Design an enzyme around this catalytic site. Structure first.
Site, PDB file in Angstrom:
ATOM      1  N   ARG B 288      88.657  57.733  59.919  1.00  0.00           N
ATOM      2  CA  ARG B 288      89.622  56.979  60.680  1.00  0.00           C
ATOM      3  C   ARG B 288      89.870  57.792  61.896  1.00  0.00           C
ATOM      4  O   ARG B 288      90.765  57.180  62.687  1.00  0.00           O
ATOM      5  CB  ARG B 288      90.760  56.327  59.949  1.00  0.00           C
ATOM      6  CG  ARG B 288      90.195  55.500  58.913  1.00  0.00           C
ATOM      7  CD  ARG B 288      89.074  54.640  59.197  1.00  0.00           C
ATOM      8  NE  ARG B 288      88.877  53.324  58.072  1.00  0.00           N
ATOM      9  CZ  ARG B 288      87.596  52.824  58.009  1.00  0.00           C
ATOM     10  NH1 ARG B 288      86.688  53.092  58.796  1.00  0.00           N
ATOM     11  NH2 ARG B 288      87.709  52.014  57.079  1.00  0.00           N
TER      12      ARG B 288
HETATM   13  N1  LIG Z   1      95.182  46.960  56.843  1.00  0.00           N
HETATM   14  C1  LIG Z   1      94.052  47.888  56.387  1.00  0.00           C
HETATM   15  N2  LIG Z   1      92.884  47.472  57.047  1.00  0.00           N
HETATM   16  C2  LIG Z   1      91.785  48.385  57.216  1.00  0.00           C
HETATM   17  N3  LIG Z   1      91.655  49.434  56.623  1.00  0.00           N
HETATM   18  C3  LIG Z   1      92.540  49.825  55.862  1.00  0.00           C
HETATM   19  C4  LIG Z   1      94.069  49.184  55.930  1.00  0.00           C
HETATM   20  N4  LIG Z   1      94.854  49.813  55.211  1.00  0.00           N
HETATM   21  C5  LIG Z   1      94.358  51.013  54.775  1.00  0.00           C
HETATM   22  N5  LIG Z   1      92.894  51.233  55.244  1.00  0.00           N
HETATM   23  C6  LIG Z   1      92.109  52.220  54.999  1.00  0.00           C
HETATM   24  O1  LIG Z   1      92.653  53.099  54.042  1.00  0.00           O
HETATM   25  C7  LIG Z   1      93.070  54.101  54.341  1.00  0.00           C
HETATM   26  C8  LIG Z   1      94.443  54.443  54.054  1.00  0.00           C
HETATM   27  O2  LIG Z   1      94.944  55.760  54.601  1.00  0.00           O
HETATM   28  P1  LIG Z   1      96.675  55.872  55.089  1.00  0.00           P
HETATM   29  O3  LIG Z   1      96.884  54.403  55.930  1.00  0.00           O
HETATM   30  O4  LIG Z   1      96.927  57.197  55.676  1.00  0.00           O
HETATM   31  O5  LIG Z   1      97.057  55.527  53.622  1.00  0.00           O
HETATM   32  P2  LIG Z   1      97.872  56.749  52.717  1.00  0.00           P
HETATM   33  O6  LIG Z   1      98.844  57.017  53.570  1.00  0.00           O
HETATM   34  O7  LIG Z   1      98.250  55.938  51.581  1.00  0.00           O
HETATM   35  O8  LIG Z   1      96.831  57.642  52.602  1.00  0.00           O
HETATM   36  C9  LIG Z   1      92.589  54.331  55.904  1.00  0.00           C
HETATM   37  O9  LIG Z   1      91.696  55.544  56.097  1.00  0.00           O
HETATM   38  C10 LIG Z   1      92.053  53.028  56.170  1.00  0.00           C
HETATM   39  O10 LIG Z   1      90.658  53.450  56.453  1.00  0.00           O
END
Ligand SMILES: Nc1ncnc2c1ncn2[C@@H]1O[C@H](COP(=O)(O)OP(=O)(O)O)[C@@H](O)[C@H]1O
Ligand SMILES: Nc1ncnc2c1ncn2[C@@H]1O[C@H](COP(=O)(O)OP(=O)(O)OP(=O)(O)O)[C@@H](O)[C@H]1O
Ligand SMILES: [Mg+2]
Ligand SMILES: [Mg+2]
Lengths: 50, 421, 542, 141, 53
Positions: B288
């Site tokens: 991402r």
């Molecule tokens: N609402 C969402 N829509 C699309 N992809 C998401 C969403 N939430 C999480 N993801 C995916 O899941 C991953 C979560 O990463 P992050 O937000 O850093 O969560 P954490 O902090 O728990 O690791 C991201 O790489 C993203 O690709």
């Protein structure tokens, strides 16, 4: 009916072998974590006395 | 015994004299080519650059892997975890990245070259020697440092070799150039640190790991950054490798490095034995940060590629295996098999990105649907061989499939001799 | 001169013991070490006896010698608080790390405050709508309450807290305080650039119109800094709550890292470990932190705290202790994320104190309980469907499975902060649209529409407007045969004229990394220090 | 609140205050039991009083046991809960009925403190989280 | 349990009678010996009982 049950029970053997294969790995992880946490408890008890 | 202090915090030699040299975890060379000459000593334990010192990741780091550069694109300054079971092709992706940095380093200016560091923690000395022979016979050793704390070395050396290699790559990051570091089996560094902690009688936590085993990897991986314009603008890209047991990615060290790195490259053990190599788990592996740092043109086709592989996994392994077949969604099965066989790629042969976007253009726009699934790997090399090389230079220079280019590409893609069929 | 000056006795990682011969500092009092490469602030944690305190360093201790002069500051860690902290990034000890000059302090407050007393508690259960369907339906957030986002490393509790920043903090009228505890530094830089771009952080002379304070103690910092940076964020929020009388937002990314940093420093403080490896003082440290975040009578703090579960274990003691401090937990699950559902909120594990019929009305409550009943009845059938298939279910249960597979796609939603890597635009969903949609899916009004029409859409209108596009498209198999002919001489030149108008770059051999390089002389024999301090080689004896 | 006393050792309080608050509440409730009246005592989160006792005893460097609890963590709850009695007519006939609360983790009834307090108390009231989400409120198993 | 047992042992040996000895929860004997064994200076055995179980 007999020939569709012969295939549905093959699908049920496949699914209940897949579920069993995942649950075996889950049991192995829980078993390893169990011996690790019990051993860590014994070491933490012995290090307060020794 | 007498212990003398040296007067200095634990340091390794950093500089341009480290390129081409095999090193242990402390800085002294083990390739038998004499001492490090054009080099200077810097600390292995450097605080990572702060918030102002960084900028957003813009530029793409091409791995040369088709499944990686299309589906999980990786930018300069990113940290991308390569996670999977043993013998699933993690080291293959890492060394394809290093070989492709050698292949792209001769075609860019010197301010855009990438100098690689390969840290081998807990590996066999034989596999490190074979990898040095590979990087020598592919010419990649000119830009590559190898730090080697093998399985015979002491566990403090296996603990410190990622920090040594990270300082050797932080030279390239701090001097405005671009670095790429691969921590191969970073799980083995946590095993060495767990050994050091339990022999120091520190109280162990989960899976007998110390409490600061998250800090051990966050110290290391936060030093891979993309520096701001007032710090030279250099970058360092990390590829940490974590080995899982039976595909358990909910383990302690696995979920620690997942919650540190930017994305993941999940290499499934089921696809690796079904011939699908590289065995990229496309449903789980994300990226991402280099999603915005993708080569355009590959961003024009690979989004549709990932969408079609997403709706390919709605009929995944129950085409007619479970109960029934539709024969209206036969097209998604006999197209997802083509997109799967398109992304398979043999070892030690990385592809330039302009020859990957043309191959996924031919696989996605529909130029290969009449090719049988047994010969799409031959159809891809036939497409790359038979299409004239001007379109590759135009797509590489313009950086996108222009509306002036897709017409000439569809022209050159309808006069190719796809074998068989 | 010798008064109020101790010396370092022993350095054990981030734990430094300092011997004060004259007079000992208090516990939690801050010290400063003289002659370090950075500003090394110690915080006194224990009195060990024999005129020795035991401290916790706020920076790294590499380079500390056991004779170094340590100055008692006579006070705990004091950080700048006030409206002059708005738009600034500051570290654990209040130093500005944003390179915008010194922080114009309205006052300097100790970061160790006692929790507000029982008479200063405000009990006002008011809803806070976030625009998220599963959050507003199944576990609504209190307007002045503590919110937890429980997650398992990759399930989306940073994307969810960024969407809550995007949706809540723009509609809010007070100040936001983001406390970054042990998260990525790239995420802090991304949030800083997004908040500068969106205008909630302004630089230079218009800095007073910025509405957010960032306090960053990220995962590159030693465990002494990650253990107290939540206290710095609490101090900046508590000044706005108490003195300014404002309503504050406080987003804390990974409140687990406070607990993990205390467990890291606790092994070197000489304690016996508690359960699975944490400190014995987990519950009291977490309580002394979390009871400072309170909607009082003179101000409110809406706290949204991301909590990290360590190995997807909710029974781990550090999230299990956090569960008792929160008004609304939003437990994100790994399996819901692996189904592609985002946000991956477990509907049968997220709870709130606002889900009560007397505070949110009986219609919303009955809809949420009906959705939870259908999802629980589907979760009861998860083993029969796996090992036997859906063809052996009853006719009443196949309807339950169909409605549950509709409502669990309908709980998912696109986010405005996820549109950069997903492509689909985000959807803000009002509360009445959520209740009106889930009424229709519960009663059976949308058994016509397929299951994927509910997936990643805003409201119940967009379900029908996606089932149209899903059935235009299967009728768009036979629309036309697309061909563009006699086109090559309109505006496109050729293959070979294009390769003549590209700008090919110059390449250089012998890259020249010897520019601006020091190149000190490393000799063969390793250099050591003798007893007079001179850099000599090793002697010839082993 | 006209008939209720509330003893409140919150999370911000020290570990001996939370350790001692069920004994304070039981001593306040024993006044009604000993003066012929009838008392009702609710020890909410007795599994947090056990955690406070664990912290208090681990920092006194007493050796830990199951889940690093003290060895005498059974006696901690047994000598607390046995004070809930129904006295004889020559002692007034007053009563005290206890409602201790234990939080389990993922329905694991086989935890240490949970099994100890099950073996101490007379009855049990089990609240399952799958009966709770099936509409059955209270979720009595 | 030793007190009830020595009452039964007097009723068996000296009086010569046939004795009933109902012991409610002999588990609490081992449990009570487990609560003191860490304070007696004994490092713990398996799951949390004393080494002398
Ligand atoms: N609402 C969402 N829509 C699309 N992809 C998401 C969403 N939430 C999480 N993801 C995916 O899941 C991953 C979560 O990463 P992050 O937000 O850093 O969560 P954490 O902090 O728990 O690791 C991201 O790489 C993203 O690709
Ligand atoms: N793309 C590919 N095509 C064909 N063969 C491959 C490919 N990638 C890897 N292999 C082969 O499969 C094996 C995988 O080894 P590799 O070192 O890449 O895996 P690994 O995950 O690092 O395993 P380990 O961690 O045990 O070393 C190698 O023998 C390699 O030759
Ligand atoms: Mg390998
Ligand atoms: Mg995060």
């Amino acid at each position: 009916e007999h020939a569709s049950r012969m295939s549905a029970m093959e699908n049920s053997t496949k699914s209940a072998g897949e579920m069993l294969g995942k649950l075996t790995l889950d049991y192995n992880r829980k078993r390893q974590a169990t011996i690790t946490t019990e051993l860590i408890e014994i070491i933490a008890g012995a290090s307060a006395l020794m | 015994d007498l212990v003398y202090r040296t007067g200095q915090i634990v340091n390794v030699p950093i500089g341009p004299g480290t390129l081409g040299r095999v090193t242990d975890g402390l800085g002294q060379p083990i390739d038998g080519k004499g001492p490090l000459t054009n080099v200077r000593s810097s600390l292995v334990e450097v605080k990572a650059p702060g918030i102002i010192a960084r900028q957003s990741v813009r530029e793409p780091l091409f791995t040369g892997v088709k499944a990686v550069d299309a589906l999980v694109p990786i930018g300069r300054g990113q940290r991308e975890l390569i996670i999977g079971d043993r013998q699933t092709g993690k080291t293959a992706v890492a060394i394809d990245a290093i070989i492709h940095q050698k292949n792209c380093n001769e075609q860019v200016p010197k301010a855009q070259r990438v100098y690689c560091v390969y840290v081998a923690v807990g590996q066999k000395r034989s596999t490190v020697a074979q990898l040095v022979k590979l990087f020598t016979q592919t010419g990649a050793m000119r830009y590559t440092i190898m730090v080697s704390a093998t399985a015979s070395d002491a566990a403090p050396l296996q603990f410190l070799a990622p920090y040594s290699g990270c300082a050797m790559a932080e030279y390239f990051r701090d001097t405005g150039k671009h670095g790429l570091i691969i921590y191969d089996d970073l799980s083995k560094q946590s095993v060495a640190y767990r050994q050091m902690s339990l022999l120091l009688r520190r109280p162990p936590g989960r899976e007998a790991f110390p409490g600061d085993v998250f800090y051990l990897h966050s110290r290391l991986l936060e030093r891979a950054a993309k520096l701001s314009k007032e710090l030279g603008g250099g970058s360092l890209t990390a590829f940490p490798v974590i080995e899982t047991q039976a595909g358990d990615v909910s383990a302690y060290i696995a979920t620690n490095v997942i919650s540190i790195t930017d994305g993941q490259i999940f290499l499934e053990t089921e696809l690796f034995y079904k011939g699908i190599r590289p065995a990229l788990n496309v449903g789980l592996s994300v990226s991402r940060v280099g999603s915005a740092a993708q080569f355009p043109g590959m961003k024009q086709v690979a989004g549709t590629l990932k969408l079609e592989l997403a709706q390919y996994r709605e009929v995944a392994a129950f085409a007619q295996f479970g109960s029934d077949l539709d024969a209206a969604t036969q097209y998604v099965l006999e197209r997802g098999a083509r997109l799967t066989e398109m992304l398979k790629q043999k070892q030690f042969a990385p592809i330039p990105i302009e020859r990957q976007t043309v191959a996924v253009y031919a696989a996605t726009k529909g130029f290969l649907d009449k090719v049988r699934v047994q010969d799409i790997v031959a159809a891809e090399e036939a497409v790359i061989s038979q299409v004239n090389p001007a379109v590759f230079k135009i797509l590489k220079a313009n950086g996108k499939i222009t509306p002036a280019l897709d017409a000439h590409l569809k022209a050159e893609l309808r006069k190719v001799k796809l074998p068989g069929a | 001169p010798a008064i109020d000056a101790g010396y370092v006795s022993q350095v054990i990682g981030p734990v430094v013991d300092v011997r004060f011969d004259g007079e000992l500092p208090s516990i939690l009092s801050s010290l400063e070490v003289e002659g370090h490469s950075v500003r090394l602030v110690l915080e006194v944690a224990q009195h060990m006896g024999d005129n020795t305190v035991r401290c916790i360093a706020m920076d790294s201790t590499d380079g500390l010698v056991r004779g170094q002069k340590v100055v008692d500051t006579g006070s705990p860690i004091k950080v700048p608080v006030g409206r002059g902290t708005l738009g600034r990034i500051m570290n654990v000890i209040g130093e500005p790390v944003d390179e915008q000059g010194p922080i114009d302090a309205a006052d300097i407050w100790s970061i160790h405050r006692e929790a507000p007393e029982f008479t200063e508690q405000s009990t006002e259960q008011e809803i806070l709508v976030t625009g998220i369907k599963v959050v507003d339906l199944l576990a609504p957030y209190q307007r002045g309450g503590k919110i937890g986002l429980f997650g398992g490393a990759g399930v989306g509790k940073t994307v969810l807290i960024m969407e809550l920043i995007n949706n809540v903090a723009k509609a809010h009228g007070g100040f936001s305080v983001f406390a970054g505890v042990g998260e990525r530094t790239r995420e802090g830089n991304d949030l800083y650039r997004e908040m500068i771009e969106s205008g909630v952080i302004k630089l230079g002379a218009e800095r007073g119109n910025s509405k957010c304070t960032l306090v960053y103690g990220q995962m590159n910092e030693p465990p002494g800094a990650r253990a107290r940076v939540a206290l710095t964020g609490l101090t900046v929020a508590e000044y706005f709550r108490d003195i300014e009388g404002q309503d504050v937002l406080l987003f804390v990314d990974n409140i687990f890292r406070f607990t993990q940093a205390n467990s890291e420093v606790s092994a070197l403080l000489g304690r016996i470990p508690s359960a699975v490896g944490y400190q014995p003082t987990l519950a009291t440290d977490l309580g002394g932190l979390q009871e400072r975040i309170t909607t009082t009578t003179k101000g409110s703090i809406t706290s949204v705290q991301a909590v990290y579960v360590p190995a997807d274990d909710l029974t781990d003691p550090a999230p299990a202790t956090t569960f008792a401090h929160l008004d609304a937990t939003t437990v994100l699950s790994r399996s819901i994320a692996e189904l592609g559902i985002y946000p991956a909120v477990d509907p049968l594990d997220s709870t709130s104190r606002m889900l009560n019929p007397n505070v949110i009305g009986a219609e919303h409550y009955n809809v949420a309980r009906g959705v939870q009943k259908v999802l629980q009845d589907y979760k009861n059938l998860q083993d029969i469907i796996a090992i036997l298939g859906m063809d052996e279910l009853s006719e009443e249960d196949k309807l339950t499975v169909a409605r549950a597979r509709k409502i669990q796609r309908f709980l998912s939603q696109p986010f405005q902060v996820a549109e950069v890597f997903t492509g689909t635009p985000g959807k803000y969903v009002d509360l009445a649209d959520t209740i009106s949609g889930f009424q229709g899916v519960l009663t059976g009004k949308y058994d016509d529409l397929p299951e994927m029409a509910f997936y990643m859409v805003g409201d119940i209108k967009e379900v029908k407007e996606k089932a149209d596009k899903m059935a235009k498209d299967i009728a768009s198999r036979k629309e036309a045969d697309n061909k563009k002919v006699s086109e090559e001489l309109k505006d496109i030149p050729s293959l070979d004229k294009l390769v003549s108008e590209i700008k090919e770059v110059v390449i250089e051999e012998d890259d020249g990394l010897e520019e601006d390089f020091k190149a000190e002389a490393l000799s063969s024999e390793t250099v050591v220090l003798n007893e007079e301090g001179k850099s000599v080689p090793l002697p010839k004896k082993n």
